[PDB]
Amino acid sequence: LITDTLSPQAFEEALRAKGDFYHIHHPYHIAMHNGNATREQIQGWVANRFYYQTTIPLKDAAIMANCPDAQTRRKWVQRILDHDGSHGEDGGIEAWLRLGEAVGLSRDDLLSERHVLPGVRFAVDAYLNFARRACWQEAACSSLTELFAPQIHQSRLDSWPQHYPWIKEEGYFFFRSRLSQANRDVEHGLALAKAYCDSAEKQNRMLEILQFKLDILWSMLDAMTMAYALQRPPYHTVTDKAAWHTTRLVLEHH
């Protein structure tokens, strides 16, 4: 715990130290990196991570709605454009659908969101609800797990082709695009964090907010582990079919 307020430069390094808990250290990721994941595990990861990807623009729009500073909104909106496309070009959500196709899943497999597990849904929804309710500065700075993302994207680019040569080349476009996007994103996030977190109280709170974000990522992979590695998906004692709910209940009627 911080007792005497860190300088902006020392505070940046305390945020970066949270990378010790990044999801690159989760066994599910480690198995994929080492070549020990199954195709079913890879497909399940791609289908479930699509729910996070399609939530990113929702959460960034939520931050914008709570942010009365036009300067900050002019920069932040680029995140929405990167994922949704500008306009019919493509964008990150389309690139994720192409990763789906590269691992053998149809566009409808991903777009239906029928394979998204409830533990993934509750973790990703927690991110959106924080973004809706927290002050904009706190919600914007919870993006800063992006500090650690280029390293994980590059790890996949380096390892997957050797172990999983059946994954089509087009599939890798998203990970390569993020090497530059995540870097520009954090150039903004860090400036915000270092300006805003100017007391020991705000610095400790922000570190706890970043821990919450890391917990979301870890918990998504825990749900995937139960379902696809341990043959304990929801209701496995009662049925062999998927029985969980499949609807963003507060955003869509059915």
Ligand X SMILES: O=C(O)c1cc(C(=O)O)c2c(n1)C(=O)C(=O)c1cc(C(=O)O)[nH]c1-2
Nearest one of 83, 29, 42 to 168, comparing CA atoms: 42
121 binds ligand X (CB under 6 A): no
Which listed range, 43-51, 62-70, 179-187, 227-235, lies at the site for Cl ion (CB under 5 A)? 179-187
Which listed range, 40-48, 78-86, 87-95, 228-236, lies at the site for its own copies (CB under 8 A)? 228-236
Among ligand X, its own copies, Cl ion, none, partner that 145 touches (CB below 5 to 8 angstroms by kind): ligand X
Shortest separation between residue 183's beta carbon and its own copies, angstroms: 25
Among Cl ion, its own copies, ligand X, none, partner that 143 touches (CB below 5 to 8 angstroms by kind): ligand X
Q: What is the rounded end-to-end Cα distance, in angstroms, of the chain?
A: 46
Cα–Cα distance for residue pair 247/254, rounded to 1 Å = 6
Angle at CA of residue 72, ends 13 and 80, nearest 5°: 95
240 binds its own copies (CB under 8 A): no
Burial of 254 (0-12, 13-18, 19+ CB in 10 A): exposed
Angle at CA of residue 239, ends 112 and 237, nearest 5°: 125
Dihedral (Cα; 9, 14, 19, 21), 10-degree rounding: -170
Which residue in this structure is represented by tokens 């949270």?
18
141 binds ligand X (CB under 6 A): no
- The answer to whether 43 and 117 are in contact (CB under 8 A) is no
Shortest separation between residue 109's beta carbon and its own copies, angstroms: 20
Interface with its own copies (CB under 8 A): 20-21, 25-27, 30, 118-119, 121-123, 125-126, 129-130, 133-134, 201, 204-205, 208-209, 211-212, 215-216, 218-219, 222-223, 225-226, 230, 232, 234-235, 237-238, 243-245, 247, 249-250, 253-254
Interface with ligand X (CB under 6 A): 56, 92, 143, 145-146, 148-149, 152, 178
